[PDB]
């Protein structure tokens, strides 16, 4: 009755894992490798296509992770290796015009450094932050001396994130989930096809996710398994919270030649008084923001429970503190003032919350050991303004008879930051060949 008919160009697909390439419109995020983007993207709405997405099993995240680390490392290949600096340092405290918080935070160090000629030496006096220097009682060494060589970041290369678009190869397509209130790990009734993602800025931070996308209707709580306290919870806000960060001290930067065409940059002195670095959020915005987060948490933790926020429990400074790059400087801000509250169902000025911050010049990124970067000091005074777009929270374990849940800031695993931008994308392979019965018979001779 019916015969097999072969069709080619059939609109079907399968989940697939392939290699994606970058595209974009000096900087660490070099655009030297990336394909210039198209004048405009296209988006095809797919009516009546319901598809299943899983943000926690998404290989786009792993590729972004590998590419970001690769670009990071490539940018340091031509930079000065500061191995002549791993010497005994003679250090005393900076006591000149220091405020109450800046006590022992800066040390004035002196050492015998190499110079252009091998038979010559020079005496160098520089200021260091305490966190970068470890005592050996005036004898100190840099903290990286017993684990790694340190490379000076090149002074002319910016650390400002540049949006990167990921693009699929021919034969593949990226499906985008357009649903609002999509938490990942589900069917998505409204989808469309794109060839490239929106530009994603590789902003690096812990605890608070800066400069990402916002939810349009409600705060969205996302997790791999919400009842597993070992998992992180990502929270996407529907409004930005503005945060104002500064490094108030006016620095004078000096440099010396330490070899044949190589130079080291260091803080020479501080022009004015010495103050602590800090970040501000308004109280009203932060307090409204948490109320919104709490209402949504109650969906998973219902029956009028008590929701408490608390400080990070411990670990390396990177995880317990809010890490970010502000104008090229590396800040570690204390968020204990943001996560100190108890919420119940019975509830309810330029006043603001000031978060004290510490600064480091020796940076060990991506949780790797054996590599380190020295961040040159920046002359002048630093100020940056960012938008808080989401949070990383963890939940305390405990008995099941508890009426209280406690949430704390988390982070340190960069892949979870990426996941907050890539959650709506899936890569599929196009499978254009297929068969179906028809009444058409091939002519026989």
């Amino acid at each position, epitope marked *: 009755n019916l015969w097999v008919t072969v069709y080619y160009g059939v609109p079907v697909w399968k989940d697939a894992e392939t290699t994606l390439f970058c595209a974009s419109d000096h900087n660490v995020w070099a655009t030297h490798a990336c394909v210039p983007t198209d004048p405009n993207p296209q988006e095809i709405h797919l009516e009546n296509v319901t598809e299943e997405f899983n943000m926690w099993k998404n290989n786009m995240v792993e590729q972004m992770h590998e590419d970001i680390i690769s670009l990071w490392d490539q940018s340091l290949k031509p930079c000065v290796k500061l191995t002549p600096l791993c010497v005994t340092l003679q250090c005393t405290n900076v006591t000149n015009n220091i405020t109450d918080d800046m006590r022992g935070e800066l040390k004035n160090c002196s050492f015998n450094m190499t110079t252009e000629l091998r038979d010559k030496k020079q005496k160098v006096y520089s200021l260091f932050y305490r966190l970068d220097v470890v005592q050996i009682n005036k004898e100190y060494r840099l903290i990286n001396c017993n684990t790694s060589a340190i490379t000076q970041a090149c002074p002319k290369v910016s650390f400002e994130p540049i949006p990167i678009h990921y693009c699929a190869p021919a034969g593949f397509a990226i499906l985008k989930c357009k649903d609002k209130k999509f938490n990942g790990t589900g069917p998505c009734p409204s989808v469309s096809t794109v060839q490239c993602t929106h530009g994603i800025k590789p902003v690096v931070s812990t605890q608070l996710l800066l400069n990402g996308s*916002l939810a*349009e*209707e*409600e705060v969205i709580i996302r997790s791999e398994n919400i009842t597993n306290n070992a998992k992180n919870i990502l929270v996407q806000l*529907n*409004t930005p919270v503005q945060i104002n960060c500064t490094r108030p001290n006016n620095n004078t930067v000096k440099s010396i030649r330490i070899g044949p065409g190589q130079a080291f940059y260091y803080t020479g002195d501080i022009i004015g008084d010495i103050r602590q670095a800090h970040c501000n959020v308004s109280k009203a915005t932060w307090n*409204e923001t948490l109320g*919104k987060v709490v*209402k*949504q948490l*109650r*969906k998973h933790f*219902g*029956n*009028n429970t008590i929701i408490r926020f608390a400080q990070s429990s411990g670990g390396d400074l990177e995880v317990t503190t809010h890490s970010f790059n502000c104008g090229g400087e590396f800040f570690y801000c204390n968020t204990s003032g943001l996560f100190n509250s108890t919420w119940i*169902s*019975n*509830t*309810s000025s330029n006043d603001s919350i000031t978060l004290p911050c510490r600064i480091k010049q020796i940076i060990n990124m991506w949780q790797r050991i054996g590599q380190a970067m020295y961040a040159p000091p920046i002359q002048g005074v630093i100020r940056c303004v960012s938008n808080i777009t989401g949070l990383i929270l963890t939940r305390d374990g405990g008995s099941t008879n508890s009426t209280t849940e406690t949430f704390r800031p988390g982070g340190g695993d960069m892949r979870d930051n990426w996941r907050s931008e890539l959650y709506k994308y899936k890569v599929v392979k196009i499978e254009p060949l297929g068969v179906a019965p028809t009444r058409c018979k091939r002519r026989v001779v």
Partner: antibody
Amino acid sequence: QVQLQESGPGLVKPSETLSLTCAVSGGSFSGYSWGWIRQPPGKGLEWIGSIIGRTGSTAYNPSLTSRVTISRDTSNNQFSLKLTSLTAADTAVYYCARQQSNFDFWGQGVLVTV
Amino acid sequence: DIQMTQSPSSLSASVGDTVTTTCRASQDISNDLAWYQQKPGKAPKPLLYYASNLESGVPSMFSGSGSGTDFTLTISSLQPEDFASYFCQQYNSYPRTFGQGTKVE
């Protein structure tokens, strides 16, 4: 303590376009959805539609979409409902409400006859 | 659209008594059902965000539960002021369908 005021007029019965402008105070628009709920006398509640404060995007009840527009202006902290071709069945109490998953804040609905 | 109804149209009740009602949906709602109390002439007063979560200013007299398609509202005792109608609302999809019912007398 958010307050909502509907500020609706009485209308012409056989045919007109309804216009209700709701003032919002004690809070703001960027974090919430806003919308209208109707209750004809003797009947329960039905949703008309809503608007997202931050983006201006809307959604409407499928039964009257061809006749309804919802829009907002955060400058005056206001949003409004516009309904065309009003005809008898449109007599109802019109309520202004603020949505954050649930409808947390309600105004004092206005009875508008048609 | 997701339709839903309440079980009783009304309940007879003593003031010094516990009364309960239900709300049933045609489609699965993942705890996203709200409850309200309405007195004649006034906008409904929100009671519950999710079936098991109270709003601010709502006394412990009110509670509820449910998931999937089957939901309940419980009032442990009534004051004369609680003799009011009740509404259930689903916010799992856009026709923001409300149920109608349970006038308590």
